[PDB]
Coordinates of N, CA and C (backbone and C1' of nucleotides) and ligand atoms in Angstrom, one line a residue:
Chain A
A1 N 38.2 -168.4 142.1 CA 37.3 -168.1 141.0 C 35.9 -167.6 141.5
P2 N 35.4 -168.2 142.6 CA 34.0 -167.8 143.0 C 34.0 -166.3 143.4
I3 N 35.0 -165.9 144.1 CA 35.1 -164.4 144.5 C 35.1 -163.6 143.2
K4 N 36.0 -164.0 142.3 CA 36.1 -163.2 141.0 C 34.8 -163.1 140.3
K5 N 34.1 -164.2 140.2 CA 32.7 -164.2 139.7 C 31.8 -163.2 140.4
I6 N 31.8 -163.3 141.7 CA 30.9 -162.5 142.5 C 31.1 -161.0 142.3
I7 N 32.4 -160.7 142.3 CA 32.8 -159.3 142.1 C 32.5 -158.8 140.7
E8 N 32.7 -159.7 139.8 CA 32.4 -159.4 138.4 C 30.9 -159.1 138.2
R9 N 30.1 -159.9 138.9 CA 28.6 -159.7 138.9 C 28.3 -158.3 139.5
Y10 N 28.8 -158.1 140.7 CA 28.4 -156.9 141.4 C 28.8 -155.6 140.7
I11 N 30.0 -155.6 140.1 CA 30.4 -154.5 139.3 C 29.5 -154.4 138.1
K12 N 29.1 -155.5 137.5 CA 28.1 -155.4 136.4 C 26.9 -154.7 136.8
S13 N 26.4 -155.0 138.0 CA 25.2 -154.4 138.5 C 25.4 -152.9 138.6
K14 N 26.5 -152.6 139.3 CA 26.9 -151.2 139.5 C 27.0 -150.5 138.2
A15 N 27.7 -151.1 137.3 CA 28.0 -150.6 135.9 C 26.7 -150.3 135.2
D16 N 25.8 -151.2 135.3 CA 24.4 -151.1 134.7 C 23.7 -149.9 135.2
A17 N 23.8 -149.7 136.6 CA 23.2 -148.6 137.3 C 23.7 -147.3 136.7
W18 N 25.1 -147.3 136.6 CA 25.8 -146.1 136.2 C 25.4 -145.7 134.8
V19 N 25.5 -146.7 133.8 CA 25.3 -146.4 132.4 C 23.9 -145.9 132.2
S20 N 22.9 -146.6 132.8 CA 21.5 -146.2 132.6 C 21.3 -144.8 133.2
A21 N 21.9 -144.5 134.4 CA 21.8 -143.2 135.0 C 22.3 -142.1 134.1
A22 N 23.5 -142.4 133.5 CA 24.1 -141.5 132.5 C 23.2 -141.2 131.4
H23 N 22.6 -142.3 130.8 CA 21.7 -142.1 129.7 C 20.5 -141.2 130.0
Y24 N 20.0 -141.5 131.2 CA 18.8 -140.7 131.7 C 19.2 -139.3 131.8
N25 N 20.4 -139.0 132.4 CA 20.9 -137.7 132.6 C 21.0 -136.9 131.2
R26 N 21.5 -137.7 130.2 CA 21.7 -137.0 129.0 C 20.5 -136.6 128.3
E27 N 19.4 -137.5 128.4 CA 18.1 -137.1 127.9 C 17.6 -135.9 128.7
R28 N 17.8 -135.9 130.0 CA 17.4 -134.9 130.9 C 18.0 -133.5 130.4
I29 N 19.3 -133.6 130.1 CA 20.1 -132.4 129.7 C 19.5 -131.9 128.4
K30 N 19.2 -132.8 127.5 CA 18.6 -132.5 126.2 C 17.3 -131.7 126.4
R31 N 16.5 -132.2 127.3 CA 15.2 -131.6 127.6 C 15.4 -130.2 128.1
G32 N 16.5 -130.0 128.8 CA 16.8 -128.7 129.4 C 16.2 -128.5 130.7
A33 N 16.3 -129.5 131.5 CA 15.7 -129.6 132.8 C 16.6 -129.0 133.9
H34 N 16.1 -128.8 135.1 CA 16.9 -128.4 136.2 C 17.9 -129.5 136.5
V35 N 19.2 -129.2 136.4 CA 20.2 -130.1 136.6 C 21.5 -129.4 137.1
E36 N 22.2 -130.1 138.0 CA 23.3 -129.5 138.7 C 24.5 -129.3 137.8
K37 N 25.1 -128.1 137.7 CA 26.3 -127.8 136.9 C 27.3 -128.9 137.2
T38 N 27.5 -129.2 138.4 CA 28.4 -130.3 138.9 C 27.9 -131.6 138.3
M39 N 26.6 -131.8 138.4 CA 26.0 -133.0 137.9 C 26.2 -133.2 136.4
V40 N 26.0 -132.1 135.6 CA 26.2 -132.1 134.2 C 27.7 -132.4 133.9
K41 N 28.6 -131.9 134.6 CA 30.0 -132.2 134.4 C 30.3 -133.7 134.7
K42 N 29.7 -134.2 135.7 CA 29.8 -135.6 136.1 C 29.3 -136.5 135.0
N43 N 28.2 -136.1 134.4 CA 27.5 -136.9 133.3 C 28.4 -136.8 132.1
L44 N 29.0 -135.7 131.8 CA 30.0 -135.6 130.7 C 31.1 -136.5 130.9
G45 N 31.6 -136.6 132.1 CA 32.8 -137.4 132.4 C 32.4 -138.9 132.1
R46 N 31.3 -139.3 132.7 CA 30.8 -140.7 132.7 C 30.6 -141.1 131.2
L47 N 30.0 -140.2 130.5 CA 29.7 -140.5 129.1 C 30.9 -140.5 128.3
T48 N 31.9 -139.7 128.6 CA 33.2 -139.8 127.9 C 33.8 -141.2 128.1
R49 N 33.9 -141.6 129.4 CA 34.6 -142.9 129.8 C 33.8 -144.0 129.1
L50 N 32.5 -143.9 129.1 CA 31.6 -144.8 128.4 C 31.9 -144.9 126.9
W51 N 32.1 -143.7 126.3 CA 32.4 -143.6 124.9 C 33.7 -144.2 124.6
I52 N 34.7 -144.0 125.4 CA 36.1 -144.5 125.2 C 36.0 -146.0 125.3
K53 N 35.3 -146.5 126.3 CA 35.1 -148.0 126.5 C 34.5 -148.6 125.3
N54 N 33.5 -148.0 124.8 CA 32.7 -148.4 123.6 C 33.7 -148.5 122.4
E55 N 34.5 -147.4 122.3 CA 35.3 -147.2 121.1 C 36.4 -148.3 121.1
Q56 N 37.2 -148.4 122.1 CA 38.2 -149.4 122.2 C 37.7 -150.8 122.2
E57 N 36.4 -151.0 122.6 CA 35.8 -152.3 122.4 C 35.6 -152.5 120.9
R58 N 35.2 -151.5 120.2 CA 35.1 -151.6 118.7 C 36.4 -151.9 118.1
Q59 N 37.5 -151.3 118.6 CA 38.8 -151.6 118.1 C 39.2 -153.1 118.3
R60 N 38.9 -153.6 119.5 CA 39.1 -155.0 119.8 C 38.3 -155.9 118.9
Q61 N 37.1 -155.5 118.6 CA 36.2 -156.3 117.7 C 36.8 -156.4 116.3
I62 N 37.3 -155.2 115.9 CA 37.9 -155.1 114.6 C 39.1 -156.0 114.5
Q63 N 39.9 -156.0 115.5 CA 41.1 -156.8 115.6 C 40.6 -158.3 115.6
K64 N 39.9 -158.7 116.6 CA 39.4 -160.1 116.8 C 38.8 -160.8 115.6
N65 N 38.1 -160.1 114.7 CA 37.6 -160.8 113.5 C 37.7 -160.0 112.2
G66 N 39.0 -159.5 112.0 CA 39.4 -158.9 110.7 C 38.7 -157.5 110.4
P67 N 39.1 -156.9 109.3 CA 38.6 -155.6 109.0 C 37.2 -155.7 108.4
Chain B
rU1 P 8.1 -136.0 136.6 O5' 7.4 -134.7 135.9 C5' 6.8 -134.8 134.6 C4' 5.8 -133.7 134.4 C3' 6.3 -132.3 134.1 O3' 6.7 -132.2 132.7 C1' 4.6 -132.1 135.8
rU2 P 8.2 -132.2 132.3 O5' 8.7 -130.7 132.2 C5' 8.7 -129.8 133.4 C4' 7.9 -128.6 133.2 C3' 8.6 -127.3 133.4 O3' 9.3 -126.8 132.3 C1' 6.6 -127.3 134.7
rG3 P 10.7 -126.0 132.4 O5' 10.2 -124.7 133.1 C5' 9.7 -123.6 132.4 C4' 9.6 -122.4 133.3 C3' 10.9 -121.9 133.9 O3' 11.4 -120.9 133.0 C1' 9.3 -122.2 135.6
rC4 P 12.9 -120.5 133.0 O5' 13.1 -119.9 134.5 C5' 13.0 -118.5 134.8 C4' 13.4 -118.2 136.3 C3' 14.8 -118.6 136.7 O3' 15.7 -117.6 136.3 C1' 13.2 -119.3 138.4
rC5 P 17.0 -117.9 135.3 O5' 18.2 -117.9 136.4 C5' 19.1 -119.0 136.6 C4' 18.6 -119.8 137.8 C3' 19.4 -121.0 138.3 O3' 20.5 -120.6 139.2 C1' 17.2 -121.6 138.2
rU6 P 22.0 -120.3 138.6 O5' 22.9 -121.5 139.1 C5' 22.8 -122.0 140.4 C4' 22.1 -123.3 140.5 C3' 22.9 -124.5 140.1 O3' 23.7 -124.9 141.2 C1' 20.8 -124.6 139.1
rU7 P 24.9 -125.9 141.0 O5' 24.7 -126.9 142.2 C5' 23.5 -127.7 142.3 C4' 23.1 -127.9 143.7 C3' 21.7 -127.5 144.1 O3' 20.7 -128.5 144.0 C1' 23.2 -126.5 145.6
rU8 P 19.1 -128.2 144.2 O5' 19.0 -128.0 145.8 C5' 18.7 -129.1 146.7 C4' 18.6 -128.6 148.1 C3' 17.3 -127.9 148.5 O3' 16.3 -128.9 148.7 C1' 19.2 -126.8 149.4
rU9 P 14.8 -128.5 149.1 O5' 15.0 -127.6 150.4 C5' 13.9 -126.8 150.9 C4' 14.4 -125.8 151.9 C3' 13.5 -124.6 152.2 O3' 12.5 -124.9 153.1 C1' 15.8 -123.9 151.9
rA10 P 11.0 -124.9 152.5 O5' 10.8 -123.5 151.9 C5' 10.8 -122.3 152.8 C4' 11.3 -121.1 152.1 C3' 10.5 -120.6 150.9 O3' 9.4 -119.8 151.4 C1' 12.8 -120.6 150.3
rC11 P 8.0 -120.2 151.0 O5' 8.2 -121.3 149.8 C5' 7.5 -121.2 148.5 C4' 8.3 -120.3 147.5 C3' 7.7 -120.3 146.1 O3' 6.6 -119.5 146.1 C1' 10.1 -120.6 146.0
rC12 P 5.6 -119.5 144.9 O5' 6.5 -119.2 143.7 C5' 6.3 -118.0 142.9 C4' 6.1 -118.4 141.4 C3' 4.8 -119.1 141.1 O3' 3.9 -118.1 140.8 C1' 6.7 -120.2 140.1
rA13 P 2.4 -118.2 141.2 O5' 1.8 -119.3 140.3 C5' 1.9 -119.3 138.8 C4' 1.5 -120.6 138.3 C3' 0.2 -121.1 138.9 O3' -0.6 -121.6 137.9 C1' 1.9 -122.7 139.1
rG14 P -2.2 -121.2 137.8 O5' -2.9 -122.6 137.6 C5' -2.7 -123.7 138.5 C4' -2.3 -124.9 137.7 C3' -2.8 -126.3 138.3 O3' -4.2 -126.4 138.2 C1' -0.6 -126.5 137.5
rA15 P -4.9 -127.2 139.4 O5' -4.4 -128.7 139.1 C5' -4.7 -129.3 137.9 C4' -4.1 -130.7 137.8 C3' -4.5 -131.6 139.0 O3' -5.8 -132.0 138.8 C1' -2.2 -131.7 138.6
rA16 P -6.9 -132.0 140.0 O5' -6.7 -133.5 140.6 C5' -6.5 -134.6 139.7 C4' -5.7 -135.7 140.4 C3' -6.0 -135.9 141.9 O3' -7.2 -136.7 142.0 C1' -3.6 -135.9 141.5
rC17 P -8.0 -136.7 143.3 O5' -7.5 -138.0 144.1 C5' -7.4 -138.1 145.5 C4' -6.0 -138.3 146.0 C3' -5.8 -138.1 147.5 O3' -6.1 -139.2 148.3 C1' -4.0 -137.1 146.2
rC18 P -7.5 -139.5 148.9 O5' -7.4 -139.2 150.4 C5' -7.3 -137.8 150.9 C4' -5.9 -137.5 151.4 C3' -5.8 -136.7 152.7 O3' -5.9 -137.5 153.8 C1' -4.3 -135.8 151.0
rA19 P -7.1 -137.5 154.7 O5' -6.6 -136.8 156.1 C5' -6.7 -135.4 156.3 C4' -5.4 -134.9 156.8 C3' -5.5 -133.6 157.5 O3' -5.7 -133.8 158.9 C1' -3.9 -133.3 155.8
rU20 P -6.8 -132.9 159.7 O5' -5.9 -131.6 159.9 C5' -4.6 -131.7 160.5 C4' -4.0 -130.3 160.6 C3' -4.9 -129.2 161.1 O3' -4.8 -129.2 162.5 C1' -3.8 -128.5 159.1
rC21 P -6.1 -128.7 163.3 O5' -6.2 -127.2 162.8 C5' -5.2 -126.2 163.2 C4' -5.3 -124.9 162.4 C3' -6.6 -124.2 162.5 O3' -6.6 -123.4 163.7 C1' -6.0 -124.2 160.3
rC22 P -8.0 -123.1 164.5 O5' -8.6 -121.9 163.6 C5' -7.8 -120.7 163.5 C4' -8.5 -119.6 162.7 C3' -10.0 -119.5 162.9 O3' -10.2 -118.6 164.0 C1' -9.6 -119.7 160.6
rG23 P -11.3 -118.8 165.0 O5' -12.2 -120.0 164.4 C5' -13.6 -120.0 164.6 C4' -14.3 -119.5 163.3 C3' -15.7 -119.9 163.1 O3' -16.6 -119.2 163.9 C1' -14.5 -120.3 161.1
rG24 P -17.8 -119.9 164.7 O5' -18.7 -120.5 163.6 C5' -19.3 -119.6 162.7 C4' -20.3 -120.4 161.8 C3' -21.2 -121.3 162.5 O3' -22.2 -120.5 163.2 C1' -20.4 -122.4 160.7
rG25 P -23.1 -121.1 164.3 O5' -24.0 -122.2 163.6 C5' -24.9 -121.8 162.5 C4' -25.4 -123.0 161.8 C3' -26.3 -123.9 162.6 O3' -27.6 -123.4 162.6 C1' -24.7 -125.2 161.4
rU26 P -28.1 -122.5 163.8 O5' -29.3 -123.3 164.4 C5' -29.1 -124.5 165.1 C4' -29.5 -125.7 164.4 C3' -29.9 -126.8 165.3 O3' -31.3 -126.7 165.5 C1' -28.1 -127.6 163.9
rG27 P -31.9 -126.2 166.9 O5' -32.2 -127.6 167.6 C5' -32.7 -128.8 166.9 C4' -32.1 -130.1 167.5 C3' -32.0 -130.1 169.0 O3' -33.3 -130.3 169.6 C1' -30.1 -131.0 167.9
rU28 P -33.6 -129.5 171.0 O5' -32.8 -130.5 172.0 C5' -33.0 -131.9 172.0 C4' -31.9 -132.6 172.8 C3' -31.7 -132.0 174.2 O3' -32.8 -132.3 175.0 C1' -29.6 -132.5 173.1
rU29 P -32.9 -131.7 176.4 O5' -31.8 -132.5 177.3 C5' -31.4 -132.0 178.6 C4' -29.9 -132.3 178.8 C3' -29.2 -131.4 179.8 O3' -29.6 -131.7 181.1 C1' -27.9 -131.6 177.8
rG30 P -30.6 -130.8 181.9 O5' -29.7 -129.8 182.8 C5' -28.7 -130.3 183.6 C4' -27.3 -129.8 183.0 C3' -26.8 -128.5 183.5 O3' -26.4 -128.4 184.9 C1' -26.3 -128.7 181.2
rU31 P -27.4 -128.0 186.0 O5' -26.7 -126.8 186.8 C5' -26.8 -125.5 186.3 C4' -25.4 -125.0 185.8 C3' -25.2 -123.5 185.7 O3' -24.6 -123.1 186.9 C1' -24.9 -124.5 183.5
rC32 P -25.4 -122.0 187.8 O5' -25.1 -120.6 187.1 C5' -23.7 -120.3 186.8 C4' -23.7 -119.0 186.0 C3' -24.8 -118.0 186.2 O3' -24.8 -117.2 187.4 C1' -24.6 -118.4 183.9
rU33 P -26.1 -116.7 188.0 O5' -26.6 -115.6 187.0 C5' -25.7 -114.5 186.7 C4' -26.3 -113.7 185.5 C3' -27.7 -113.1 185.8 O3' -27.5 -111.8 186.4 C1' -27.7 -114.2 183.7
rC34 P -28.6 -111.4 187.5 O5' -29.8 -110.8 186.6 C5' -29.5 -109.8 185.7 C4' -30.7 -109.6 184.8 C3' -32.1 -109.6 185.5 O3' -32.3 -108.3 186.1 C1' -32.2 -111.0 183.6
rC35 P -33.5 -108.1 187.1 O5' -34.8 -108.3 186.1 C5' -36.1 -108.8 186.7 C4' -37.0 -109.3 185.5 C3' -38.2 -110.0 186.0 O3' -39.3 -109.2 186.4 C1' -37.1 -111.3 184.4
rA36 P -39.6 -108.8 187.9 O5' -40.5 -110.0 188.4 C5' -40.0 -111.3 188.6 C4' -40.5 -112.2 187.5 C3' -41.8 -113.0 187.9 O3' -43.0 -112.2 187.8 C1' -40.2 -114.5 186.9
rU37 P -44.1 -112.3 188.9 O5' -44.7 -113.8 188.7 C5' -45.4 -114.4 189.8 C4' -45.1 -115.9 189.9 C3' -45.2 -116.5 191.3 O3' -46.6 -117.0 191.5 C1' -43.1 -117.1 190.4
rA38 P -47.1 -117.4 192.9 O5' -48.4 -118.3 192.6 C5' -49.7 -117.7 192.3 C4' -50.3 -118.4 191.1 C3' -50.9 -119.8 191.5 O3' -52.2 -119.8 192.1 C1' -49.6 -119.9 189.5
rG39 P -52.7 -121.0 193.0 O5' -52.2 -122.3 192.2 C5' -51.6 -123.4 192.9 C4' -52.6 -124.5 193.1 C3' -52.6 -125.3 194.3 O3' -53.8 -125.9 194.7 C1' -51.9 -126.7 192.5
rA40 P -55.0 -124.9 195.3 O5' -55.8 -124.5 193.9 C5' -56.2 -125.5 193.0 C4' -56.3 -124.9 191.6 C3' -57.7 -124.5 191.2 O3' -58.0 -123.2 191.4 C1' -56.8 -126.1 189.6
rA41 P -59.5 -122.6 191.2 O5' -59.5 -122.3 189.6 C5' -60.7 -121.7 189.0 C4' -60.7 -121.9 187.5 C3' -62.0 -122.2 186.8 O3' -62.8 -121.1 186.5 C1' -60.4 -123.8 186.1
rA42 P -64.4 -121.3 186.3 O5' -64.5 -122.2 185.0 C5' -65.8 -122.4 184.3 C4' -65.7 -123.5 183.3 C3' -67.1 -124.2 183.0 O3' -67.7 -123.5 181.9 C1' -65.4 -125.8 183.4
rC43 P -69.3 -123.5 181.8 O5' -69.6 -125.1 181.8 C5' -70.8 -125.6 181.2 C4' -71.3 -126.8 182.0 C3' -72.7 -126.7 182.7 O3' -73.7 -127.0 181.8 C1' -71.2 -127.5 184.3
rA44 P -74.4 -125.8 180.9 O5' -75.9 -126.1 180.9 C5' -76.6 -126.7 182.0 C4' -77.5 -125.7 182.8 C3' -77.6 -124.3 182.2 O3' -78.6 -124.2 181.3 C1' -77.1 -124.3 184.6
rG45 P -78.3 -124.3 179.7 O5' -77.0 -123.5 179.5 C5' -76.9 -122.2 179.0 C4' -77.6 -121.2 179.9 C3' -77.4 -119.7 179.7 O3' -78.1 -119.3 178.6 C1' -77.3 -120.3 182.0
rG46 P -77.7 -117.9 177.9 O5' -78.1 -116.8 179.0 C5' -78.6 -115.5 178.7 C4' -78.0 -114.5 179.7 C3' -76.8 -113.7 179.2 O3' -77.2 -112.7 178.3 C1' -76.3 -114.5 181.4
rU47 P -76.5 -112.4 176.9 O5' -75.4 -111.3 177.3 C5' -75.6 -110.4 178.4 C4' -74.3 -109.9 179.0 C3' -73.1 -109.8 178.0 O3' -73.3 -108.7 177.1 C1' -72.4 -110.9 180.0
rA48 P -73.4 -108.9 175.5 O5' -71.9 -108.9 175.0 C5' -71.1 -107.7 175.1 C4' -69.7 -108.1 175.5 C3' -68.9 -108.9 174.4 O3' -68.6 -108.1 173.3 C1' -68.5 -109.7 176.5
rA49 P -68.9 -108.6 171.8 O5' -67.6 -109.4 171.4 C5' -66.3 -108.7 171.3 C4' -65.2 -109.6 171.8 C3' -64.8 -110.8 170.9 O3' -64.0 -110.3 169.8 C1' -64.9 -111.6 173.1
rA50 P -64.2 -111.0 168.3 O5' -63.0 -112.0 168.3 C5' -62.9 -112.9 167.1 C4' -62.1 -114.2 167.6 C3' -62.6 -115.5 166.9 O3' -62.1 -115.8 165.7 C1' -62.6 -115.7 169.3
rG51 P -62.9 -115.6 164.3 O5' -63.1 -117.1 163.8 C5' -62.0 -117.9 163.4 C4' -62.3 -119.4 163.8 C3' -63.5 -120.0 163.1 O3' -63.1 -120.5 161.8 C1' -63.6 -120.5 165.4
rC52 P -63.7 -119.9 160.4 O5' -64.5 -121.2 159.8 C5' -65.7 -121.1 159.1 C4' -66.6 -122.3 159.5 C3' -68.0 -122.2 159.1 O3' -68.2 -122.8 157.8 C1' -67.9 -122.7 161.4
rU53 P -68.9 -121.9 156.6 O5' -70.5 -122.2 156.9 C5' -71.0 -123.6 156.8 C4' -72.3 -123.7 157.5 C3' -73.4 -122.7 157.1 O3' -74.1 -123.2 155.9 C1' -73.3 -122.7 159.4
rG54 P -74.7 -122.2 154.8 O5' -76.0 -121.6 155.6 C5' -77.1 -122.5 155.9 C4' -78.1 -121.8 156.8 C3' -78.8 -120.5 156.2 O3' -79.9 -120.9 155.4 C1' -78.0 -120.1 158.4
rU55 P -79.8 -120.6 153.8 O5' -79.9 -119.0 153.7 C5' -81.2 -118.4 153.3 C4' -81.8 -117.6 154.4 C3' -82.2 -116.2 154.1 O3' -83.4 -116.1 153.5 C1' -81.0 -116.3 156.2
rA56 P -87.6 -121.9 148.5 O5' -88.6 -122.9 147.9 C5' -90.0 -122.8 148.2 C4' -90.7 -124.1 147.9 C3' -91.4 -124.3 146.5 O3' -90.5 -124.8 145.6 C1' -92.9 -124.9 148.3
rU57 P -90.1 -124.2 144.2 O5' -91.3 -124.6 143.3 C5' -91.8 -126.0 143.3 C4' -93.2 -126.1 142.6 C3' -93.2 -125.8 141.1 O3' -92.7 -126.9 140.3 C1' -95.0 -124.6 142.1
rU58 P -91.3 -126.9 139.6 O5' -90.9 -128.5 139.6 C5' -91.8 -129.5 140.1 C4' -91.3 -130.9 139.7 C3' -89.8 -131.1 139.9 O3' -89.6 -132.5 140.4 C1' -90.3 -131.4 137.7
rU59 P -89.7 -132.9 141.9 O5' -88.3 -133.3 142.3 C5' -87.1 -132.6 141.9 C4' -85.8 -133.4 142.1 C3' -84.5 -132.7 142.3 O3' -84.3 -132.4 143.6 C1' -84.3 -134.4 140.7
rU60 P -84.5 -130.9 144.2 O5' -85.2 -131.2 145.6 C5' -86.4 -132.0 145.7 C4' -86.1 -133.3 146.4 C3' -86.0 -133.2 147.9 O3' -86.9 -134.2 148.5 C1' -84.2 -134.4 147.1
rU61 P -88.5 -134.0 148.6 O5' -88.7 -133.3 150.0 C5' -89.9 -132.5 150.2 C4' -89.5 -131.2 150.9 C3' -88.9 -130.1 149.9 O3' -89.4 -128.8 150.2 C1' -87.4 -130.5 151.8
rU62 P -89.8 -127.8 149.1 O5' -91.3 -128.2 148.7 C5' -91.6 -129.3 147.9 C4' -92.9 -130.0 148.5 C3' -94.2 -129.4 148.1 O3' -95.2 -130.3 147.9 C1' -93.9 -129.3 150.4
Ligands
LIG1 MG1 27.2 -129.3 149.4

RNA sequence: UUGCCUUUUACCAGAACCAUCCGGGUGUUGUCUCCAUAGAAACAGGUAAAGCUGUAUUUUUU
């Protein structure tokens, strides 16, 4: 259990870093700043995965406490 | 922080910080150079030349 805890923590940290980075990027993209074509694709990918995660979490929520 | 862009150098041109560099000033020492190269002149005056002053009838002195 302790290991599972620790890893859960560290991925939450990493996850936090990721999500915030993504958010920063998307504002940056909106602004129309210098940004790497590759970087923009990366951000698109991240934000998609993020969106899917959000979405299916909402599905879970819907299930877990009725319509 | 913007721009070109989009990958970095290289860059756009603004900011704030800072540094580098091309030079500069004096002052003092010292050297290098070109010229030099005297160990004593005044006083008494005269000569000539330079620095100031001078050319009584009510308050300065007639
Ligand atoms: Mg590469």
